[PDB]
Amino acid sequence: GYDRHITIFSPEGRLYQVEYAFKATNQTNINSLAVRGKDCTVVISQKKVPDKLLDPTTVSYIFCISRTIGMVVNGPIPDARNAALRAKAEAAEFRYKYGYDMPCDVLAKRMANLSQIYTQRAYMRPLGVILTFVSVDEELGPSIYKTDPAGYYVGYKATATGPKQQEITTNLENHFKKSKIDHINEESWEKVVEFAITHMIDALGTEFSKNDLEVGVATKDKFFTLSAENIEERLVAIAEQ
Amino acid sequence: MTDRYSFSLTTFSPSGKLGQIDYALTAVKQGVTSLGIKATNGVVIATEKKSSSPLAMSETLSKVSLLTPDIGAVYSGMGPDYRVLVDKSRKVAHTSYKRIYGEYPPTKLLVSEVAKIMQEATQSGGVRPFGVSLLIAGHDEFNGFSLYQVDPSGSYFPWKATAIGKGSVAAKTFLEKRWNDELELEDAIHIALLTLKESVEGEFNGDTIELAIIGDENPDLLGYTGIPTDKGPRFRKLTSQEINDRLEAL
Amino acid sequence: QFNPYGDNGGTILGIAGEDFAVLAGDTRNITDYSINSRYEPKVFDCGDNIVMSANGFAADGDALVKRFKNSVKWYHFDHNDKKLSINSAARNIQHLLYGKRFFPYYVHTII
Amino acid sequence: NNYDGDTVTFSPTGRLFQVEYALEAIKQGSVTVGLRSNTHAVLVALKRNADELSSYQKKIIKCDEHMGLSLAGLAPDARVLSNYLRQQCNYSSLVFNRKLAVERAGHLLCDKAQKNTQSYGGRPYGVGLLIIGYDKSGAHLLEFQPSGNVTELYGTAIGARSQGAKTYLERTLDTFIKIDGNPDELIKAGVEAISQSLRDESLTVDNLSIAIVGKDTPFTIYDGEAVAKYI
Amino acid sequence: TGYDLSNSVFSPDGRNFQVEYAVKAVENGTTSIGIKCNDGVVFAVEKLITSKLLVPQKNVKIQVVDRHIGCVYSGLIPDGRHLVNRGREEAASFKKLYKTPIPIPAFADRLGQYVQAHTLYNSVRPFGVSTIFGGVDKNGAHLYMLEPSGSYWGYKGAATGKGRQSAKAELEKLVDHHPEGLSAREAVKQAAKIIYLAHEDNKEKDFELEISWCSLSETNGLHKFVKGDLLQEAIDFAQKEIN
Amino acid sequence: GYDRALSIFSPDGHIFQVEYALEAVKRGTCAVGVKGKNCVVLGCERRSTLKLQDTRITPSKVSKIDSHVVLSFSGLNADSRILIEKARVEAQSHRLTLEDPVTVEYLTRYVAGVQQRYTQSGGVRPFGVSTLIAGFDPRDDEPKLYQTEPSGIYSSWSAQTIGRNSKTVREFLEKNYDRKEPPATVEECVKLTVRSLLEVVQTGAKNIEITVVKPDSDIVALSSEEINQYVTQIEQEKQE
Amino acid sequence: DRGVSTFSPEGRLFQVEYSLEAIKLGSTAIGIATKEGVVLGVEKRATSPLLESDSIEKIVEIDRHIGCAMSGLTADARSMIEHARTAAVTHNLYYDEDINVESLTQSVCDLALRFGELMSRPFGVALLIAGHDADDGYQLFHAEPSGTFYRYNAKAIGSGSEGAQAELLNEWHSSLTLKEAELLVLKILKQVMEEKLDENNAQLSCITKQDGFKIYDNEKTAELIKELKEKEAAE
Amino acid sequence: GSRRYDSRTTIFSPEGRLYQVEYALESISHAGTAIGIMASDGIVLAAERKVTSTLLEQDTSTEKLYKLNDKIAVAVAGLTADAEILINTARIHAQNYLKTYNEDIPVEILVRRLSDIKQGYTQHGGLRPFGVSFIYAGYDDRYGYQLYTSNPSGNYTGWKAISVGANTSAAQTLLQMDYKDDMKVDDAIELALKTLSKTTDSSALTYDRLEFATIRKGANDGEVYQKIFKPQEIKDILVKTGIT
Amino acid sequence: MDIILGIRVQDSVILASSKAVTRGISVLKDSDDKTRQLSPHTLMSFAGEAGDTVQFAEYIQANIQLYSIREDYELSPQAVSSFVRQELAKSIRSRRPYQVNVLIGGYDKKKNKPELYQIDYLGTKVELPYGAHGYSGFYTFSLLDHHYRPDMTTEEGLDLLKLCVQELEKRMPMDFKGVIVKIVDKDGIRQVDDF
């Protein structure tokens, strides 16, 4: 049964190598979450540093692709960094060729098209990663676009990825049923980050120290990651309410 | 390194079947239902927008795509395979026709070029066939309106009306009862919505249905004036609001 | 425009006796009306009792002597340390020179 | 078993069987010995015939005036690897007017053998080499294995029953390392070393191959009546 | 099954068994470590003395990249040399275009992307080495460890080979007992102690100790081998601690 | 490019793809070559499970390589066209550089060389064809018959057959061909050829093709009636 | 299947070992080296009596001072001979001298391992290369598809080889005359050949410094066959 | 490596047959029948469309019968997508010959080159062969009217009448029965339709399931006309011979 | 090279071609045949650059002979002329173009008609009753314009050709050592030995 080893169709019209690449996604046992404010797009991810010998500052699954685009990865770090370098190079070339900054959704479509090729070409394996792209696009505004090993991509009001994704997803669905809107009706990014952590705590049912989390924030004309003390400042604010 | 797969991955079995093409059609069967109906003064192509999550924005995922100002495409099967076929289809309409003749290709020829791209994925080294069936609707001055189905094999057939995917068998039987050679475009849209409701289970509205027409020239959608011979695209995507207007008189 | 050739002057002379041969050359090296070196040898022992001089453009002269010396080395490696006879050396140097027929070595070669 | 089809496959315990099978070709090869002092480095090789009508397969190859090796295993593979060393030694001389350091010679062979163990279609080299040389840091002996592993030693031996000579040299280490400014004595020690690897056969005049390089001695090979001195 | 017979093939788990198999080759290799310190990094490795006939100090295993980076690895030694040869090509092209010597994080990803690339195709074999490497750049000291999968992280201390667990336990004690930091000269001595303690898992053959270091104060930011008086001082310190 | 080594050695030392190419030859229609004192005759079987054929336009079994040399074959028809094309191009190339038409030996040696190349090239299978090559060297009246086969070996024959039931007709020729006295005339040589095919063929109707090559580019193909006269004459002598 | 350049667990290349089996099926070829010259003899082995035996060409000239005999898949030898001839003539053009027999043999053996996934498979033919040069005099070489060549005083290759080689072990001495060698090749060929040896199914050749490489006429070999039969009866 | 997944499309069976060519022919035997009949004053091409649906557009359709130039046409049996690849090559090859020699390409030269392309895919390149059999109907001033067939092996032969695709065994027997040499085009039209009607796997032969074409000298004086029949013209010719 | 002429009459094409090969101040040869037979009923004469002429002539000859052997059929003079034109038309935009001018005299057996084609090194083809290449035209064309009739016999054609050679031998600066005359008709190609 070599139809399970390479990206050709099984008798039931399935690509097992694509399906198994999806299972590689959860290998890190990390859950990620993205939401949109009025002015910003916040992405948060769990940070598990099990080894005491690791330098914790170098353990990261959030990447600054361009000045405006950030990307969090669900999957092994080798494949994660492979995707990040290509995304950076693609976003840099786009700007040189076309004279304006690559939109989040266009970079998503391009990275998805590359992922699609690996599902059709035999010599290339899919990357065992799901890529969540975030920005505040100068045309579309706060934007979340997500890619998978199948080469699928779509825009989101909010999204979650990882082993306990379904719990976070329904938690967010139930909030947006209640609020009746497409986003977090909040002025400051600081409170949208607080919302993201609050709704992750409720869905996962765990408490977080400053070193258990990782936060990216996209605003107009820059995407930046938060320090341990920026997150600690945020954790204190939630606790005092 | 380098692509060592320089040999065919689709080969003839003793019985004469081409395994990977058969298995590709199986993937198309599993795919969500899409259909096309040809009226006298236009063509309609429709499909259900199967949402992956209620947090997803199904507007950002377009199943119905403009190829030329007078040609549109919809599919059943694997979305990613369709997306790259649309990119390749749009480019070949320019490189192998517009850049030579200074005008857009007629439907049958663009369809022919897409069929060639899908045929090569059947015979070339180290590739599986595309896991999609296309329905391409279009207009051109010398052939009028036309509707084509392109299969994973690279075979294409002209249709008066047809469906592909999940509930195609039932949909085709429904279309046979309702189709005549005197249907007006509005009568074809009405039948397209009726036929799709049978195969759709959940919500049936302008946000869960994607529907486009090939009809009259749209000067308002051209984006400029001053050239009398340029009169605008015949391809138009119906808005979420325009669908719900027709679902009341259903 | 860049001229890839120069003239380093000097002269050489080869005479053959019954059981010996001499290859003589002056040690002066020049460009235009200046002396570069009063002692720059351009007659070389290439092994297997072959002496060689390539007189004219010293850069091409040195390049050729260098390649022929290397040719003698590989002749040993490829043919069980066999001695390269003067007649075989001559035929080999022809192929070294004619190999650059359309960008010649600007040298007069005597062995 | 299922993991020995090609060099590009690891076994479940992290072995490369094709590389191990290449290593096995060396073990079947005729014994060759290498040893050195501070002034000279000496190769000694037992040569092997097809029958009494055939010549004796030459085991020793010259690389430069200051370097050369002995071979055990696939002889054509030794011809490829020796030819590569000849070019690398030569490149160093023409471009830098510099004699290639015996250590760099090792590093270059290691990297050439390695590439054949990580790519599809290729195969590992099926030969082991003992490289001797005299450079700016004195006398040297290297052992090349086609796994890519190169090792600098005072003495060693590779081939069938090499363990006998390798044990002997391990015992004789303190004696032969201080045979300075005496070629014939360093050879005698190498000929006695290879004698610990003989079974039913003894060293004859068209059987024994000796090479030497050192302070005031270019890499030179002795065959036929020139080795009669050492039987 | 048969999912483990070909590189770049996902198992139903989502694993690349061929990489996991390369990891087995690493576990089999000798112990190597890296200790990050105040203003630099220290590397040490276990060299098993197979025979009396090995020339001491003359089978060097630690390698330099550029003039400011040191690399040491456990597993298939040739595979390690291939990775350093690439490392040198990457570092040279960086210095050529950008003038400044390659920063350690930049250099880490260059090795990382290269090793990761050998998990993408069935026509290449994964690397049979874990590599501990680092040095000093404009932002101070960095230590890294890179694994056959292409995975790498920044480390306070790093260990790999047959005595990795022994060495890791010993590294963790230093991190706990020195929160302010370890000095370059102290870290050299500790490296010698840890290699001797990690030798218990490989104690049939006795071994030869090899240490190197980069320090902003001690070696002026450049990679240097620890030899002579400083090496014998570090060996003596290690010998005292096992007894 | 497709690289696969399709022709390889088996443990017993056979190249099965070359040997299986010979089985394709054994399936092909019988072809026979007989050389006389002053001529070579090429005879060829044509299977009669095909009625409604058009014999004007259907590819002939014997091909001209030059005006003085001919090539007949047994095996895969499509494969033979590639060998004939290359042979005809080499025929013109030889005339251009040597200023002399090919010898039959040379033209054969080239065709055999091509066949051999396809047995140790990557990504190709051997030719499912054996050839009979017959003619006369420029300014020479000595008859020449050569045979090639998929392996790439070629040799000269006084008379030879290839294809299905070739062993039966070879048996016939082996007792009916005198080396000391080859068929002294065209008539004798055609008859011995037609006789040898009638051992295997069926009806001597539109089943047998005969081509006669004589010295100095003198090649003609016999018609049905001409061949039918040989068939009629042989059967009447047989009833004895 | 499996790679073409794969090692067996015993450390041998499958395809090289299998090609050695193909050569054992080949027709017998014998070479004997003397101080008066080298003799090369082959069994022609015609598959049928209608095949004109003189068209069987298993002894071949490389240059005036080098000749060659073959055994196995003889079609494979054509490109080996073509290379050998070009190597010999090219060396004469570059160095105005004859190329050493050993240097020729080493050049042919370089083609051998140029297979894998270069040609698709090893050669299925072994060559006996016999010649003379001024340095090492008269020489006989056995060139295998492994890329290895041995110098031999005498050597048999093909179906009858192991039996013929055992005979050559007894018969060869360092003082054989050219005529003694000629008769010895005929004698040992007649022993290992299936069909009865004559001038039509066996061929002799020799290389001498003076007259170079010469394939013998069927008339010349027939008289040596008659001289051989008379000498065996004469004790 | 990739050796594992190589079908080896271009190898021999132990019996000396090409697996893929045999299996491609087996594929073609399920494709709709196509018949060619060569008369003294023209050629008929008839072909049965593969089980039609009532909502198929029949007039603007081409599946079986394609035009190569003004003097040559082909009937197709097998994968249509594979056929169009070969038809476009054949069309270009015809124009290359006209551009070079300023004369229309002789039919056999075109048929040989198209057959030579098929042969290549069976000997080298490790690709699957084209699953197509062609009936070539054409005219040139050398041989006049000519019918040929080629198949995935790259073997071609000339015919007076021939069938390809489904039920060739039954179709060939019926053609062999009622064909004679002095036949006219209108007689050949009838034979073609009568044969398909008896060998069809359908209930009854109708205009919508047929493609039809004639190559006559029935233009005006010493020139050849290609007629690809319109739906209504097939409906009329089916009534004229009394099949419906 | 230099002088090549051609006259088409009722039943045949006649080609006259100068016999001199001059290099510098030496006439090296006075018997040179500046023609190749492409097929039994097609002859091509050529004039132009040294080496280029014979190389192009023999290259065309090989291609037509290859076609003949493949199809067992003779290409029409029109077809051969169109092939030769296209080869030159390719050549003119090459890195080194063929500097060769040709006349093609043929007898179309299907039409039973003689045909003469003039093609220059650019690939300029014309069908003509009479043709010349180089300076020869400047004397012959005006002469043939006068004396030529379309219904002339081969014998009349040869007398009309004698008039052209006479005029060239009177007024041309260079000694071209006379001409080799060849006739193309229904029975193929034959050479006039006494001119």
Give me the helix-helix angle, E164-177 and E184-198, nearest 10°: 150
- Reduce the secondary structure of chain F to three states and give it as a string: CCCCCCCCCCCCCCCHHHHHHHHHHHHCCCEEEEECCCCEEEEEECCCCCCCECCCCCCCCCEECCCCEEEEEEECHHHHHHHHHHHHHHHHHHHHHHCCCCCHHHHHHHHHHHHHHCCCCCCECCCCEEEEEEECCCCCCCCEEEEECCCCCEEEECEEEECCCHHHHHHHHHHHCCCCCCCCCHHHHHHHHHHHHHCCCCCCCCCEEEEEEECCCEEEECCHHHHHHHHHHHHHHHCC
Query: What is the rounded distance in angstroms from the CA atom of residue B160 to the CA atom of residue B169?
Result: 16
Closest Cα partner for E10 from H20, F62, I101, A7? A7
For residue A133, the domain's CATH number is: 3.60.20.10
| H or E segment and range at residue E229 | helix E228-242
Query: What is the rounded distance in angstroms from the CA atom of residue F88 to the CA atom of residue G22?
Result: 34
For residue G173, the domain's CATH number is: 3.60.20.10
For residue H206, the domain's CATH number is: 3.60.20.10
User: Who contacts F185 (Cβ-Cβ below 8 Å, separation ≥6)?
Assistant: F36, F37, F38
Strands (E), chain E: 32-37, 40-48, 63-65, 69-75, 129-137, 140-146, 152-154, 157-160, 207-215, 223-225
Within 8 A of D6 by CB-CB distance, chain H residues are 1
The Cα-based distances of F156 to E88, F131, F203 in angstroms read: 64, 12, 30
3-state secondary structure of C55: strand
Which amino acid is residue H191, in one-letter code?
L
Which tokens sit at F4? 């696969």
The boundaries of the domain holding residue G216 are: 1-235
- Reduce the secondary structure of D60-121 to three states and give it as a string: EEECCCCEEEEEEECHHHHHHHHHHHHHHHHHHHHHHCCCCCHHHHHHHHHHHHHHCCCECC
The boundaries of the domain holding residue A154 are: 1-241
CA dihedral I129, I133, I135, I139 (to 10 degrees): -10
Closest Cα partner for B51 from B170, B205, B172? B205
Count of structural domains, chain A = 1
Strands (E), chain D: 32-36, 40-46, 60-62, 67-73, 127-135, 138-144, 150-152, 155-158, 208-214, 217-222
Query: What is the rounded distance in angstroms from the CA atom of residue G43 to the CA atom of residue G29?
Result: 6
Closest Cα partner for A48 from A227, A222, A158, A208? A208
Cβ pair D119:B4 closer than 8 A: no
Nearest neighbour of F88 by CB, restricted to I59, I63, I70: I70
Active site residues of E: 30
Which tokens sit at C49? 């009792």
Strands (E), G46-164: 59-63, 66-72, 125-133, 137-143, 149-152, 154-157
Count of structural domains, chain H = 1
Query: What is the rounded distance in angstroms from the CA atom of residue A77 to the CA atom of residue H189?
Result: 71
Helical H segments across A205-227, by residue range:
none
Q: Which of the four CATH numbers 3.40.50.620, 2.40.50.140, 1.10.3470.10, 3.60.20.10 does domain E1-243 have?
A: 3.60.20.10
Give how far G123 is from chain H: nearest CA, Å.
Answer: 21
D99 touches chain C (CB under 8 A): no
Nearest neighbour of F64 by CB, restricted to I59, I63, I69: I69
Q: Name beta bridge partners: B125.
A: B8
Closest Cα partner for A9 from H107, B10, D6, F224? B10
- Residue B98 DSSP symbol: I
The neighbours of chain G, by the rule of 3 or more Cβ pairs under 8 Å, are C, D, F, H
Within 8 A of H6 by CB-CB distance, chain B residues are 7
Q: Give residue for tokens 């006789």.
A: F195
Q: Name beta bridge partners: D185.
A: none
Ramachandran region of residue I28, left (φ > 0), alpha (ψ -120 to 50) or beta?
alpha
User: Who contacts E18 (Cβ-Cβ below 8 Å, separation ≥6)?
Assistant: D9, D10, E4, E6, E7, E8, E9, E119, E125, E126
Contact status, residue I56 vs residue I101, Cβ threshold 8 Å: no
Q: Look at the alpha carbons of E86, E92, E95, E97 in this order and tell me if their dihedral is positive or negative.
A: negative
Which amino acid is residue B143, in one-letter code?
N
Q: Give residue for tokens 């008929």.
A: H44
Q: Could you tell me how many residues make up chain G?
A: 235
Using a 10 angstrom Cβ sphere, with 0-12 exposed, 13-18 middle and 19 or more buried, the burial of residue F59 is: middle
Contact status, residue B12 vs residue H130, Cβ threshold 8 Å: no
Contact status, residue I30 vs residue I43, Cβ threshold 8 Å: no
Strands (E), B31-186: 34-38, 43-48, 65-68, 71-77, 132-140, 144-150, 156-158, 161-164
| H or E segment and range at residue B177 | helix B168-178
Structural method: X-ray
Q: Name the closest residue on chain A to residue B30, using Cα atoms.
A: A13
Query: What is the rounded distance in angstroms from the CA atom of residue G41 to the CA atom of residue G20?
Result: 21
Query: What is the rounded distance in angstroms from the CA atom of residue D226 to the CA atom of residue E11?
Result: 64
Query: What is the rounded distance in angstroms from the CA atom of residue E100 to the CA atom of residue B247?
Result: 68
What does this entry list as its resolution, in Å?
3.1
Within 8 A of A158 by CB-CB distance, chain B residues are 55
D123-161 in b/e form (b: 16+ CB < 10 A) is: bbbbbbbbbbbbbeebbbbbbbbbbbebbbbbbbbbbbb
Q: Look at the alpha carbons of C65, C66, C72, C75 in this order and tell me if their dihedral is positive or negative.
A: negative
Q: Name beta bridge partners: B242.
A: none
Closest Cα partner for D43 from D225, D193, D228? D193
Count of structural domains, chain I = 1
Query: What is the rounded distance in angstroms from the CA atom of residue E120 to the CA atom of residue E108?
Result: 19
CA dihedral D144, D146, D148, D150 (to 10 degrees): -10
Within 8 A of H4 by CB-CB distance, chain E residues are 6
For residue B94, the domain's CATH number is: 3.60.20.10
Cβ pair A122:H5 closer than 8 A: yes
**Domain range F1-240, CATH architecture:** 4-Layer Sandwich (3.60)
E interface toward A at CB cutoff 8 Å?
2-3, 6, 8-15, 36, 105, 109, 112-113, 115-117, 119-123, 143, 149-159, 168, 171-172, 175-176
- Residue B219 DSSP symbol: G
Using a 10 angstrom Cβ sphere, with 0-12 exposed, 13-18 middle and 19 or more buried, the burial of residue B237 is: middle
Hey, how many other C-beta atoms are within 10 angstroms of the C-beta on H120? 15
Contact status, residue F37 vs residue H32, Cβ threshold 8 Å: no
Q: Could you tell me how many residues make up chain A?
A: 241
Nearest neighbour of G7 by CB, restricted to D21, D51, D121: D21
Query: What is the rounded distance in angstroms from the CA atom of residue E183 to the CA atom of residue H124?
Result: 68
Q: Could you tell me how many residues make up chain F?
A: 240
CA angle at H100 for the pair H98 and H105, rounded to the nearest 5°: 35
Hey, how many other C-beta atoms are within 10 angstroms of the C-beta on C39? 7
CA angle at D128 for the pair D123 and D131, rounded to the nearest 5°: 130
Query: What is the rounded distance in angstroms from the CA atom of residue I28 to the CA atom of residue I21?
Result: 6
3-state secondary structure of B242: helix
Within 8 A of D122 by CB-CB distance, chain G residues are 5, 116
D2 touches chain E (CB under 8 A): yes
Cβ pair I78:H106 closer than 8 A: no
The CA radius of gyration of chain A, in Å to the nearest whole number, is 18
Q: Could you tell me how many residues make up chain C?
A: 111
Query: What is the rounded distance in angstroms from the CA atom of residue E228 to the CA atom of residue E34?
Result: 21
**Full DSSP string of I108-166:** ETTTTEEEEEEE-TT--EEE-SEEEEGGGHHHHHHHHHHH--TT--HHHHHHHHHHHHH
Query: What is the rounded distance in angstroms from the CA atom of residue F153 to the CA atom of residue F169?
Result: 22
B125 touches chain F (CB under 8 A): yes
Closest Cα partner for E235 from E197, E200, E193? E193
Contact status, residue I99 vs residue I48, Cβ threshold 8 Å: yes
Give how far B168 is from chain D: nearest CA, Å.
Answer: 47
Query: What is the rounded distance in angstroms from the CA atom of residue G118 to the CA atom of residue G126?
Result: 19
Query: What is the rounded distance in angstroms from the CA atom of residue H135 to the CA atom of residue H34?
Result: 8
Which tokens sit at E189? 């001595």
Is the pair G, A in contact (3+ CB pairs within 8 Å)? no
Count of structural domains, chain G = 1
F58 touches chain I (CB under 8 A): no
Contact status, residue G115 vs residue G68, Cβ threshold 8 Å: no
Query: What is the rounded distance in angstroms from the CA atom of residue F7 to the CA atom of residue G120?
Result: 7
Cβ pair C80:G100 closer than 8 A: yes
Which tokens sit at A122? 């035999």
The boundaries of the domain holding residue I85 are: 1-195
Query: What is the rounded distance in angstroms from the CA atom of residue D125 to the CA atom of residue D115?
Result: 10
Domain residue extents for chain E:
1-243
Backbone angles phi, psi at D143, to 5 degrees: -115, 120
CA atoms within 13 A on the CB side of H207: 18
